[PDB]
Design a protein around this ligand. Structure first.
Ligand SMILES: [Mg+2]
Ligand SMILES: [Mg+2]
Ligand SMILES: [Mg+2]
Ligand SMILES: [Mg+2]
Ligand SMILES: [Mg+2]
Ligand SMILES: [Mg+2]
Ligand SMILES: [Mg+2]
Ligand SMILES: [Mg+2]
Ligand SMILES: [Mg+2]
Ligand SMILES: [Mg+2]
Ligand SMILES: [Mg+2]
Ligand SMILES: [Mg+2]
Ligand SMILES: [Mg+2]
Ligand SMILES: [Mg+2]
Ligand SMILES: [Mg+2]
Ligand SMILES: [Mg+2]
Ligand SMILES: [Mg+2]
Ligand SMILES: [Mg+2]
Ligand SMILES: [Mg+2]
Ligand SMILES: [Mg+2]
Ligand SMILES: [Mg+2]
Ligand SMILES: [Mg+2]
Ligand SMILES: [Mg+2]
Ligand SMILES: [Mg+2]
Ligand SMILES: [Mg+2]
Ligand SMILES: [Mg+2]
Ligand SMILES: [Mg+2]
Ligand SMILES: [Mg+2]
Ligand SMILES: [Mg+2]
Ligand SMILES: [Mg+2]
Ligand SMILES: [Mg+2]
Ligand SMILES: [Mg+2]
Ligand SMILES: [Mg+2]
Ligand SMILES: [Mg+2]
Ligand SMILES: [Mg+2]
Ligand SMILES: [Mg+2]
Ligand SMILES: [Mg+2]
Ligand SMILES: [Mg+2]
Ligand SMILES: [Mg+2]
Ligand SMILES: [Mg+2]
Ligand SMILES: [Mg+2]
Ligand SMILES: [Mg+2]
Ligand SMILES: [Mg+2]
Ligand SMILES: [Mg+2]
Ligand SMILES: [Mg+2]
Ligand SMILES: [Mg+2]
Ligand SMILES: [Mg+2]
Ligand SMILES: [Mg+2]
Ligand SMILES: [Mg+2]
Ligand SMILES: [Mg+2]
Ligand SMILES: [Mg+2]
Ligand SMILES: [Mg+2]
Ligand SMILES: [Mg+2]
Ligand code: NA
Lengths: 184, 46
RNA sequence: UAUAUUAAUAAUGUUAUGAAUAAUUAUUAAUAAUAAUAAACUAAGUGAACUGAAACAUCUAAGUAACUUAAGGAUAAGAAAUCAACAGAGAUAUUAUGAGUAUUGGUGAGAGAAAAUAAUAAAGGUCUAAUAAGUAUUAUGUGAAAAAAAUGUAAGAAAAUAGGAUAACAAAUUCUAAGACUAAAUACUAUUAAUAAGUAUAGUAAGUACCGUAAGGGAA
RNA sequence: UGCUGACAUGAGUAACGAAAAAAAGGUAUAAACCUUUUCACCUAAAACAUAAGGUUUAACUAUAAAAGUACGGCCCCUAAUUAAAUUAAAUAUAAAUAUAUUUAAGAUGGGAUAAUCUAUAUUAAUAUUUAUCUUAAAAUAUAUAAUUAUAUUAUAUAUUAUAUAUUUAUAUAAUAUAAACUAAUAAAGAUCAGGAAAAUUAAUGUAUACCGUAAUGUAGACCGACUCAGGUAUGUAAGUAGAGAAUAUGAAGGUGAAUUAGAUAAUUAAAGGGAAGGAACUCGGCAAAGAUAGCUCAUAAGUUAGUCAAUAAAGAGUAAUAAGAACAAAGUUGUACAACUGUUUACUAAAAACACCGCACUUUGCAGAAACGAUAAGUUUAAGUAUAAGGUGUGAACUCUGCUCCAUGCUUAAUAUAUAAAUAAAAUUAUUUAACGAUAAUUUAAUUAAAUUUAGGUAAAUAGCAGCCUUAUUAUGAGGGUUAUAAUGUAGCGAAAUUCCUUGGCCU
RNA sequence: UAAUCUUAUACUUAAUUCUUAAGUAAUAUAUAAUAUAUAUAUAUAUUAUAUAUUAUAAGAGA
């Protein structure tokens, strides 16, 4: 977020090097914004981004503009650390997984308004044709005289319900989630 | 918009699509060629 | 780059100190290469629909068309864990009778054996296996319109004192699975010969002309 | 409405495909061929160069001439993409095949040297898009070093005169139009943030391969069945004029044609003019007519503040007063619908329909959601990570968006609650057996799902928003009492693109 | 958790390379003995015996 040219950032993903070791006391020095480290080092409560899953793999979660996660708890017994992601889903992440300190840049990205259709086209976004505009053959919402919704439940062109229908369900669900994201 | 001129020649494209070697290279094209040979065709491909 | 290397010699000219280093020609020895290959017939895999049932959905069409794969001059099958019925037969293949009979079917449409007796047929019997286990059998899901032998999932035997065969059981009978080979009659193609109440619009050109981007269609 | 062939009929009818021709002569053979002269047409083309294409049509068989420099291919290199190719076991798969990775191919692109002409081999060794302003500098004139006004301002070459290497080289100075245009340079604005891939010295080389080259190419030589007013890529495109590639003309070049000659009724087409009237036409001002500068000024209400409205209407200056080329320029307003620029039925609909930017809902934590995959591996999503991506509705913004979960769904919680397959062992029964046994069914015993039900939640999910009675002198109905329901139409709007009765009543 | 699954990344003999076998050197693990330090247990060093040269790391996990 507040990073500007001239700032200095380290990374303690390998570990605390012999420079800083020779010269908590270390935690406060380390937990400056912009520098990366394992969630074990990152104190409980503080805001983070580019949160990893595994102790070896890269930062996956919380990458977009003005997004962030928050460290909620850490369990050295199970080698996990409960982290709240931007969605609000509380989630187990490996205790030795990587995460940068601070919120992501460009918080005001969301407030941009594209002026015109052409801007969307430039960005690489072709037009969405509504299901109600289509013929019945093309989309369930299609058909009817005048404009009608056909008494048809809001759903995709391939019949998957659009409003509220949980798509990841049953056995195939997320094992690592502690508390599901706030919904509606 | 007047129709009729759907053929728009370009030798290279023709040879790519309908040339002998294209037929030979594909399995389906090889089968076509064989079929034409069986029929008795003088001209198997472009 | 095979009118090639690589080496060994021989002849030629140049470099540096009789010996050494590179180039060109000519012999000798060494090193790799050329898929244009049928089609029909056979076997295997996957497998429609129109259609019929005066509708249609089981059923039918049909294991057909088609696509796919693989083999041989043919392939397949073949010397009984077969049939039969207390009498007997003796591999298989094709045809005639048996017989549109038994059998079976939304018991509709319709489908339909075998034994036995005849032909055709070739010498038609003969070991190649240390005699066969995740096999027979069972449950279950499928499976040639009758008649099974197959098969995914999983339980799973027996030694000839045994095992297979029929709703079931008892008697009897018959055969020996889980190892094998096999001409001949047959299919298709080509050739030769002979016979045509066949063809000159089924009588030789041309898969050409021409049509189509193309698969493909196709004259006189 | 049989098939094939032949031949009729309409009929010597229509038509002969945008078109400017004339004479003389080749030739006592020419409307059509060739030549000469005249006339016309195209001229940012009907010209000249080319690309692609094609029965070589060409100025032709005695035929389209390349080592390379404002020459192309071939070649090297790669993009998009392609590949019976590539890796006891790359992965997946009824077969076919498909996937991932390698390698190979693949131009529409990149590729060294060059007239003072140039040398490509072998061996060895370590670059989206747009812009060039202002300032500043010096130069030229007016006024009294400094002000005012005007052009000029990075590069492109010949001449002359100097200073150094020695008439050939290097540097310096001075001389020298305007308007376009090119390339190469420099600095730099905007978000939409801008390809890929293939070293250098030295020595030794280099006898320079193949293919393209005609003509046609806004067309009679290609794609349209035709010598078809259609379709067809690029570069030059004389001057005069102009803001210009508009428009007029046309230097040069090319062309004047498989139909001609006459006549020009009715009638049709495509044009020109029109008294008096001026929409009386008609479904409807359809069609036609209508431009008192195009430059410089000036330009309102409204408004989302955007000269949006505007190119405002009117109007002024310059020009012209009887007029006297073409081309650009064709009013003002009210309402309905849609924010807008866009898109759409190639060949009857361009719209009020689609899209849109914005708004809202929702799904998915990434070994995700979505889609595709006889079905997989896997691929897109994404080299992204919830301010992201997919799905759904609505459709910029202002003022706003009421009440309702009954139903269909979704969503959460309850052993509330049934039933499917799957199992031990053991009881009668039935069949059989001389007997045990064997074979069938049937019934018991612990451990049961999702579903369903119930109760919430969810309407910018799918959806819904009743009727009767009668009370303030008559009327109206603020009220009052009922039934029904999940709730009972709120704000607004209203004979609406929604109103049948209906040409509703009233006003303009 | 060696069920499953996901992700990432030397010499010598015998039949120039290729493979077998023997012993030796090198590394790792398991077992036994000896010595030393701390609170019957843990750590370090040395010696003997046995095994290995798809792996390691991370994650999910009956
Ligand atoms: Mg849309
Ligand atoms: Mg529609
Ligand atoms: Mg549908
Ligand atoms: Mg409606
Ligand atoms: Mg055609
Ligand atoms: Mg193509
Ligand atoms: Mg078959
Ligand atoms: Mg029928
Ligand atoms: Mg019918
Ligand atoms: Mg059948
Ligand atoms: Mg055989
Ligand atoms: Mg046996
Ligand atoms: Mg046996
Ligand atoms: Mg069975
Ligand atoms: Mg049958
Ligand atoms: Mg046997
Ligand atoms: Mg056999
Ligand atoms: Mg007739
Ligand atoms: Mg007539
Ligand atoms: Mg006439
Ligand atoms: Mg006429
Ligand atoms: Mg004459
Ligand atoms: Mg013009
Ligand atoms: Mg030309
Ligand atoms: Mg290549
Ligand atoms: Mg090119
Ligand atoms: Mg040419
Ligand atoms: Mg030329
Ligand atoms: Mg043509
Ligand atoms: Mg035509
Ligand atoms: Mg034409
Ligand atoms: Mg001009
Ligand atoms: Mg002229
Ligand atoms: Mg011309
Ligand atoms: Mg003409
Ligand atoms: Mg008049
Ligand atoms: Mg008048
Ligand atoms: Mg009238
Ligand atoms: Mg008009
Ligand atoms: Mg105003
Ligand atoms: Mg105009
Ligand atoms: Mg619109
Ligand atoms: Mg249309
Ligand atoms: Mg139209
Ligand atoms: Mg539309
Ligand atoms: Mg949008
Ligand atoms: Mg999915
Ligand atoms: Mg979204
Ligand atoms: Mg809409
Ligand atoms: Mg809005
Ligand atoms: Mg509402
Ligand atoms: Mg049960
Ligand atoms: Mg209405
Ligand atoms: Na509809």
């Amino acid at each position: 977020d507040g990073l500007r040219p001239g700032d200095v950032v380290e990374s303690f993903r390998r570990g605390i090097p012999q420079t800083l070791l020779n010269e908590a006391i270390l935690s406060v020095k380390t937990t400056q914004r912009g520098n990366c480290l394992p969630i074990s080092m990152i104190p409980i409560g503080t805001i983070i981004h580019n949160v990893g899953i595994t102790p070896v793999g890269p930062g996956k979660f919380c990458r977009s503009a003005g997004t962030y996660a928050r460290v909620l708890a850490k369990l050295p017994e199970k080698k996990k650390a409960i982290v709240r992601l931007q969605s609000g889903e509380h989630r187990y992440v490996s205790l030795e997984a990587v995460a940068t300190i601070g919120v992501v840049s460009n918080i005001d990205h969301q407030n941009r308004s594209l002026g015109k259709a052409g801007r969307s086209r430039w960005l690489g976004i072709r037009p969405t044709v509504r299901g109600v505009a289509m013929n019945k053959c093309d989309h369930p919402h299609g058909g009817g005289r005048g404009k009608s919704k056909s008494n048809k439940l809001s759903m995709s062109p391939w019949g998957q319900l659009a409003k509220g229908y949980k798509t990841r369900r049953g056995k195939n669900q997320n094992r690592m989630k502690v508390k599901d994201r706030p919904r509606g | 918009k007047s129709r009729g001129n759907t053929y728009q020649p370009s030798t290279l494209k023709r040879k790519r699509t309908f040339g002998f070697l294209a037929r030979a290279k594909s399995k389906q094209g090889s089968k076509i060629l064989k079929r034409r040979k069986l029929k008795g065709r003088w001209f198997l491909s472009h």
